[PDB]
Design a protein around this ligand. Structure first.
Ligand SMILES: CCCCC[C@H]1CCc2nc(C3(COC)CCCC3)c(-c3nnn[nH]3)c(-c3ccccc3)c2C1
Length: 130
């Protein structure tokens, strides 16, 4: 389907502001800001796996749509995550400390477009097939 593949980050807008809003400290934002991860999405039956791979940080989640799971994020938050498919978009909410953030992954033409929202801050990251 639309999401399976290896997707290399090619553009990012407002990610520093987004990380700051989430609570990431300056030193960590500095390393992240310049990073160009690959996002590797695969599916096996009911289980979707998403890996992010980069020089300074690798992460992986596996999940079933609509089933809450515990996630340790790249920035070491311990969150409760739920991912659903709504109108073709993978909508990922992370909840922690009465806070939330959403990560929406959408397929647009040749691109994987990822919108991250924390309060009034929105970051848009575009990835293209490796
Ligand atoms: C180098 C350590 C940096 C730690 C700071 C953290 C800050 C939060 C954060 N959030 C995300 C997303 C948002 O999730 C809330 C962005 C859209 C997908 C998930 C990503 C990411 N994953 N895949 N693509 N972008 C990364 C990240 C991971 C590896 C390299 C660069 C950035 C980081 C790094």
């Amino acid at each position: 389907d639309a999401f399976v593949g290896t997707w290399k980050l090619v553009s990012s807008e407002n990610f520093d502001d987004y990380m700051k809003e989430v609570g990431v400290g300056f030193a960590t934002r500095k390393v992240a800001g310049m990073a160009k991860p690959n996002m590797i999405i695969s599916v096996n039956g009911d289980v979707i796996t998403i890996k992010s791979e980069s020089t300074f940080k690798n992460t992986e989640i596996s999940f079933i749509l609509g089933q809450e799971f515990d996630e340790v994020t790249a920035d070491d938050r311990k969150v409760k995550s739920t991912i659903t498919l709504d109108g073709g978009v993978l909508v990922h909410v992370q909840k922690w400390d009465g806070k939330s953030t959403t990560i929406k992954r959408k397929r647009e033409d040749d691109k994987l477009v990822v919108e991250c929202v924390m309060k009034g801050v929105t970051s848009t990251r575009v990835y293209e097939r490796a």
